[PDB]
Amino acid sequence: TRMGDKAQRTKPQMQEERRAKRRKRDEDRHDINKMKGYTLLSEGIDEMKETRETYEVLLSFIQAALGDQPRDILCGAADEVLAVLKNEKLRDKERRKEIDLLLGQTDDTRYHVLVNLGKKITIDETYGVNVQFESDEEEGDEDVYGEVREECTLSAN
Amino acid sequence: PQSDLRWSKQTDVGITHFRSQLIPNLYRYIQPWESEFIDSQRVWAEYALKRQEAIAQNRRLTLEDLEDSWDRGIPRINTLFQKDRHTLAYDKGWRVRTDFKQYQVLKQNPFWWTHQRHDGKLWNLNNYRTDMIQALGGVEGILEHTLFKGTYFPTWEGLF
Amino acid sequence: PKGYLTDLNSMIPTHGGDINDIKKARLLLKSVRETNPHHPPAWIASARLEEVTGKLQVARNLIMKGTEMCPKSEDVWLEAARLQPGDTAKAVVAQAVRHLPQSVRIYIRAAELETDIRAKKRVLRKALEHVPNSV
Amino acid sequence: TRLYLKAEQERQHNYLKDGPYITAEEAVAVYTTTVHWLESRRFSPIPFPPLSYKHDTKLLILALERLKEAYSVKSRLNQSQREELGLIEQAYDNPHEALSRIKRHLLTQRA
Amino acid sequence: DDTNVYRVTIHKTFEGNLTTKPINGAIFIFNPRTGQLFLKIIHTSVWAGQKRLGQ
Amino acid sequence: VDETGRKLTPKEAFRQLSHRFHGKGSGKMKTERRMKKLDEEALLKKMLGTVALLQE
Numbered sequence: 001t002r003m004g005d006k007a008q009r010t011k012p013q014m015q016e017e018r019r020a021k022r023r024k025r026d027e028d029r030h031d032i033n034k035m036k037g038y039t040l041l042s043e044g045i046d047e048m049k050e051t052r053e054t055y056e057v058l059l060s061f062i063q064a065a066l067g068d069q070p071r072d073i074l075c076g077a078a079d080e081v082l083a084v085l086k087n088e089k090l091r092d093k094e095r096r097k098e099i100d101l102l103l104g105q106t107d108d109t110r111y112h113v114l115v116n117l118g119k120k121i122t123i124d125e126t127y128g129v130n131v132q133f134e135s136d137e138e139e140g141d142e143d144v145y146g147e148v149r150e151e152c153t154l155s156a157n
Numbered sequence: 158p159q160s161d162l163r164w165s166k167q168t169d170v171g172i173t174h175f176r177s178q179l180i181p182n183l184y185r186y187i188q189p190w191e192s193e194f195i196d197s198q199r200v201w202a203e204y205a206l207k208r209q210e211a212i213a214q215n216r217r218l219t220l221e222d223l224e225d226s227w228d229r230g231i232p233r234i235n236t237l238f239q240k241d242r243h244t245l246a247y248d249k250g251w252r253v254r255t256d257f258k259q260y261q262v263l264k265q266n267p268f269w270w271t272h273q274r275h276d277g278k279l280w281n282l283n284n285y286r287t288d289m290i291q292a293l294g295g296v297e298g299i300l301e302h303t304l305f306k307g308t309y310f311p312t313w314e315g316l317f
Numbered sequence: 318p319k320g321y322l323t324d325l326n327s328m329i330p331t332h333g334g335d336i337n338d339i340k341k342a343r344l345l346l347k348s349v350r351e352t353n354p355h356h357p358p359a360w361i362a363s364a365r366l367e368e369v370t371g372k373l374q375v376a377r378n379l380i381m382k383g384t385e386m387c388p389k390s391e392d393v394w395l396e397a398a399r400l401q402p403g404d405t406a407k408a409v410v411a412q413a414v415r416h417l418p419q420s421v422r423i424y425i426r427a428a429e430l431e432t433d434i435r436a437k438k439r440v441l442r443k444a445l446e447h448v449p450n451s452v
Numbered sequence: 453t454r455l456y457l458k459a460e461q462e463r464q465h466n467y468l469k470d471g472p473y474i475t476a477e478e479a480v481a482v483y484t485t486t487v488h489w490l491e492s493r494r495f496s497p498i499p500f501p502p503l504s505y506k507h508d509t510k511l512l513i514l515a516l517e518r519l520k521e522a523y524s525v526k527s528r529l530n531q532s533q534r535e536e537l538g539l540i541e542q543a544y545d546n547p548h549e550a551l552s553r554i555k556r557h558l559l560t561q562r563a
Numbered sequence: 564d565d566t567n568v569y570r571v572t573i574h575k576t577f578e579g580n581l582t583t584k585p586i587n588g589a590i591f592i593f594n595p596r597t598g599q600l601f602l603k604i605i606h607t608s609v610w611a612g613q614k615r616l617g618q
Numbered sequence: 619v620d621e622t623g624r625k626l627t628p629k630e631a632f633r634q635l636s637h638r639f640h641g642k643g644s645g646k647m648k649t650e651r652r653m654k655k656l657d658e659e660a661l662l663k664k665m666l667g668t669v670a671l672l673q674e
Contacts, residue, residue: 004192006185008284009228012220019221032381041407041427047415123389126356131348131569133617142238146220148208151243154490154497247510254518262522318559321500325552328503336546337614345571345583358573362581597667 013140022145048075051121058082058117065103065110085118162294164301177294186285193279197231204234233277245274334370342366350383357383357390364396376400384409388416394423403430419448501555509547516540564591568605585611 012018030049040046048071058078063069066077081099088095092115100111143149162177204223211218218237226234236242255272259265271279293299300306300313310316346366350359360383367376380397387393394413398406407430413423424444428437445451472479501508519540523529529537543550568588575581588605620626626634637643644652 001185003184004188006181006284006288007188008281010281010283012224012227015220015224019219022219031385039404039408040411041404041431043408046408046411123391124355124357124387125575126353126358127572127574129349129356129359129571129573130352130566131345131571132352132566133344133348133569135617139240141240143240146238147217148219148223148237149217149242152496153494154487156484156487156491244510244513247507248514258522264524321503321559322556324503325555329552330548341614342583349571349573349583356573358575358581361575362573362583365581594667599667599670 012146015146018146022147025145045071048072054117054120061110061114061117062103065106081114082118082121085115086121088118161302162298164294164298166297175297177298178292180292181285181288183282183285186282187280193231196229200226200229200234201232204230228278228281231276231279233279236275236277239274241274248275251275339366339370350379354386357387357393359383360387360393361396364400368400373400381409384412391417391420391422394420395426398423398426398430403432406430421451500558503555508551512543512547512551516544564593567591569610 027049034049035046038046055078058081059074062074062077062081066074069077080102085095085099095115096108096111099114100106103110103114159176163174164176165172165174167173204218204226207222208218211222220238223234223237228235239245251272252270255266256269259269290296290299296313305313343366346359346363349356350363353359360380364376364380364383367373367379377400380393380400383393384390384397391413394409394417397409398413400406401409407427410423410427410430414420414427417423421444424440427440431437431440467473519536523533523537568590570586570588572584572586573581574584585607587607590603590605592601592603594600643649
């Protein structure tokens with residue numbers, strides 16, 4: 001017999017649960033982190049999360065069918081298209097002559113492509129409050145997210 | 158003794174007899190100081206590399222990495238995740254303070270040389286407990302010698 | 318020693334704040350805001366307590382949460398603007414105008430944060446463009 | 453214990469009768485050595501803790517935790533120990549007032 | 564049902580401060596069979612100055 | 619089972635066994651308490667909203 005043999009090292013407790021908590025916190029704080037460093041007074045794009053990919057594909061289609069225009073133009077066109085196809089009140093046969101006319105009358109193929117875009121798009125007093133006193137916030141004393149945070153002389157005369 | 162590992166059990170079929178050695182020792186489960194020190198140097202160099210890389214990536218070292226280094230390093234890697242880490246960053250001379258406690262607290266401290274908060278837990282004995290049960294002959298073999306079966310509880314799962 | 322004791326007897330707080338009552342009120346307002354995310358008063362009160370006692374960063378985070386959970390709330394937006402440092406207070410202020418166009422208090426806070434004639438002129442020109450009929 | 457305390461009192465009275473066993477020359481020699489070493493190291497004397505020290509609350513929390521650690525609960529603590537526990541809880545509750553008390557004592561208390 | 568035991572009113576004065584007024588709560592004890600409801604009133608003074616936690 | 623035909627819990631079954639074994643039963647007060655409990659159970663099992671509605 002040696003000495004270390006049969007010695008074992010444990011595994012992090014609740015590793016997966018802490019990972020899930022971290023994932024939920026990050027997907028909830030994604031908005032805050034996205035808008036953290038955007039100094040809006042010094043940022044011109046602030047005025048202008050899986051809806052953002054839909055907005056991006058809308059912008060890509062508009063860029064393809066519009067000809068690489070500034071970001072303000074692209075955002076305005078995207079807002080116009082999404083808002084008008086949402087406020088059409090499911091009136092479809094009228095959408096060609098307007099939207100495809102605006103985009104250049106490419107074809108009904110791209111018409112059926114773009115209808116998918118509108119398909120995938122989607123100060124109070126408050127008197128009376130309820131409160132609950134509970135002894136929650138019990139953990140294992142470890143990090144809530146499994147992360148490693150980091151942050152005259154004498155003289156003789 | 159080989160006799161002590163014999164145990165019976167009855168059910169509607171009848172009675173059935175079974176068996177399952179020497180007791181484990183502590184030293185086999187304690188890790189040598191030399192291995193401790195070498196692995197500490199190695200693991201902490203690895204962590205320094207990982208930390209530089211994660212600072213480059215602009216994230217914090219998550220628990221998923223540094224998982225193969227869980228109970229390793231003389232300052233254990235576990236201590237890197239404690240809530241009180243930032244506060245502890247201001248405790249200096251704690252080793253001398255712990256050593257001197259003997260002149261203030263009457264109780265004798267066996268762990269006069271380390272603090273759980275700073276150095277981490279340097280040992281582990283869950284394996285020792287499980288091996289002790291197995292060597293003694295399994296829960297049923299152990300329970301044979303007691304009066305449990307006289308209580309007539311159906312099973313040993315919901316007892317306290 | 319005499320000078321330091323004088324400085325200490327000057328430092329002694331004349332208002333203090335019963336720590337236990339402060340904790341009780343903190344728990345009460347935490348329950349408030351948790352139960353009703355759409356109560357601008359809840360976030361405003363939480364931030365006011367956390368700024369009068371404790372430190373300001375927790376109140377600031379609570380108020381970034383509250384501004385987004387209570388859109389169309391000039392009072393909460395102004396709480397955020399006043400609590401945030403000037404540079405990011407401006408970002409809060411213009412987020413407030415984006416959520417609430419025609420927000421004259423918010424625009425005034427924008428100007429007061431900018432503290433420069435050119436930026437004030439530009440912001441007021443934009444505000445007039447938005448709403449010309451405001452004396 | 454009683455014999456050791458008797459011997460210690462003998463020691464103290466013998467000291468008071470025989471004065472400092474360290475002669476003035478030895479005292480000045482060691483003092484000069486210490487000042488020379490500190491000058492060489494370029495050491496800056498520790499100042500009296502300012503009124504608005506950044507970490508004073510951290511230090512107070514560490515001190516109170518260390519004081520609490522000395523209670524391995526046996527469920528039977530005497531009057532003085534329980535009173536000290538109460539004082540520790542009070543300091544935990546209101547850190548700033550305890551700091552004011554501490555600085556007052558460090559400045560004036562000598563008995 | 565004891566979720567209504569502790570409820571507060573938060574009324575603003577736009578200049579100077581904001582006040583929260585603890586209001587009386589109710590413990591509801593409802594019998595589905597006879598429909599008898601014992602609603603116990605919890606006065607504000609019971610917990611307005613209690614100096615106690617949820618314990 | 620007791621003479622009345624009710625299933626008997628093991629505790630009072632052994633109570634009756636021990637009584638019959640030693641040769642002395644329980645006291646008069648205990649007998650009265652037991653019987654009053656039995657008739658309490660019978661009365662409860664053989665069966666104020668309207669009053670509250672009318673008084674409201």
